[PDB]
Structure 1
């Protein structure tokens, strides 16, 4: 790549800011067939859970206006397989591609187990805590909806992680600011947001929800305005960097993420529509930067950070 597109984030020395979002790129195996994965800034692989999980019953996806619903349920082969097979494959084939590991679980003990082990992977440069999961201990309340509960989790995971810890925020809250400050106070090195919103679709013939799980996560361009709003809200009072995502589909969206306060950008759902979306965004970024008087993403970050109040 080139200097204009490079960003340095804790644990992440990215050649460009484009990172496929967790759950939308598997472990890179399938999309490697399409293009040289080395073209990417990094990759957020799908969630790893202490134990393997089959996931939810089908159907698991549904289409919405400019978005999609999914209720995959975090299917993954488990930590063991991931440590011995999935991660090694990426390191063996793309030694230099830094990968961000997404971590999920049903209770604090599960997150802790994964965080403590996954950092041993030579290629894993940072951890992304998926806190949108139901806390079985707290009746089923997502860790990402209570500031003190999220904070407790981040601290515990921080004490045991060997790489930087990024926490992915949920947009399904009344006020995201308290959760963000709390997580920052707990030791997080950065934040990523947003995970999906919640939606439902009904089948008119059957009169039943299309998804077997009833509710699903809503993603795609439809949610970009929400992502931009929350990112922007959080950037105003946090000193750690943010990796933004939610509805990014082109270089213009990426640049808009920067205007809101993001330091890097992840692309999820768009990969399903166009598997070459990331490389195209990467190639088009400079033309667009030229057009808007941006010397480099690095300079843009500081300009946006100082034009505050």
Structure 2
């Protein structure tokens, strides 16, 4: 199955369809269930149980259309979004580009979004089914964005907390799509979160870019610890273009994802974990396509990982591949389970 998808099915789909069409078709098949975990992999973090540490990253299911199909694919948690307060169309097409020679993607969707109300009703339609999933170790995250024309960014995020916070196990404030300002924004987000009833009160995480200065990262770490933010997601796509990219489309505007981002992300995880003294959970994301990629991020300080771009090259079988390879490496390196490996590089 893994070799069939990787060598025949996916490159044939890649040859027939532009990338955005292929993505919409993938969302449709996934939402319909048309698709091909040991105790070692279980993680307790963010007030929840995660049956395995491999999640689908924000951007694949922007509108909350495919959540149950994504669990069926084998992900330990699903993050939907980003969702903006009002519906908006995003940038003109084409707005996403494959770099097959680099195992990379560049995108400038621009927060195309069905908007909070539509996503609210979509998640309400399965709210009790989610409550059982979460209880069974399959939590749901909701990533919040802001409309293009908004004047008050904090009020857009506050709206998302009030509308989708009650349906989420965790919320993501994505201030990273391609110090006192951040403190102001996050104080307002956390106040809105704390005003939700306890059974409907999610964890709040901040998702950051890999393109931050050292000053930026220091200031983020300080605010996150000061305010009691529950976690970090590290990282979004990069607006850098590392030397060595071969794809003809490498100079398209947008955020770069996939293998060229991987170690830039891992190093950002490493720094943020050290700057927060290992006390702030990190979801690590960027260029994960194997168990080794996942364990490097875990050893660098991630309690959980996500992927997206690998799914677009290798198809659904990549999820089970990453999990199988991660379990094998954990045993080889003598860890009793994922939990013991979190942050392990910092104890050498």
| Global fold match (TM > 0.5) | yes
Query: Is this contact kept in 2: 1:199–1:215, CA < 8 A?
Result: no
> Structure 1's 90 and 63: CA in aligned 2 closer, same or farther, altered over 3 A?
farther
Report the alpha carbon displacement of residue 274 of structure 1 after superposing the two structures with TM: 2.1
- Per the alignment, residue 106 of structure 2 pairs with 69
The aligned residue for residue 216 of structure 1 is 254
1:253 deviation in Å?
Answer: 0.4
| TM-aligned CA distance change 1:10 to 1:93, over 3 Å | closer
State how many pairs are aligned. Answer: 282
Matches of 1:269 and 1:298, distance apart in 2: 25
**CA apart distance, 1:223:** 0.8
Matched, 1:243 2:292: no
Query: Which of the two has greater helix per residue?
Result: 2
* Alpha-carbon separation, structure 1, partners of 2:116 and 2:70: 27
Paired position in structure 2 for 1:130: 174
Match of 1:170 among 204, 209, 226: 209
Q: For 1:68-217, list aligned pairs within 5 A.
A: 68-86=105-123, 88-89=125-126, 92=129, 95-96=132-133, 97-105=138-146, 106=150, 107-121=153-167, 124-132=168-176, 147-161=179-193, 162-175=201-214, 176-198=217-239, 215-217=253-255
2:90 paired residue among 52, 55, 64:
55
Contact 1:53–1:78 under 8 Å retained in 2: yes
Equivalents in 2 of 1:34, 1:152: separation in Å? 35
Deviations 1:249-272 (A, max 9, x none): 111100010121111101121111
Structure 2: unaligned runs, 5 residues or longer: 1-36, 194-200, 242-248
1:42 maps to what in 2? 77
- SS of the aligned residue for 1:45 comes to strand
Unaligned stretches of 5+ residues in structure 1: 135-146, 201-208
Contact 1:247 1:269 in 2 (8 A): yes
Distance 1:87 1:303 in 2: 40
Q: Aligned-pair distance for 1:172?
A: 2.0
The normalised TM-score by structure 1 is: 0.83
Q: What CA distance in whole angstroms lies between the structure 1 residues aligned with 2:141 and 2:43?
A: 15
The structural deviation recorded for 1:150 is 1.6
- CA 1:261–1:66 in structure 2 vs 1: closer, same or farther (change >3 Å)? same
- What SS does the aligned partner of 1:225 have? helix
Q: Using the alignment, how far apart are the partners of 1:231 and 1:117 within structure 2?
A: 30
Distance 1:84 1:25, change over 3 A: closer
Post-superposition offset of 1:35? 7.3
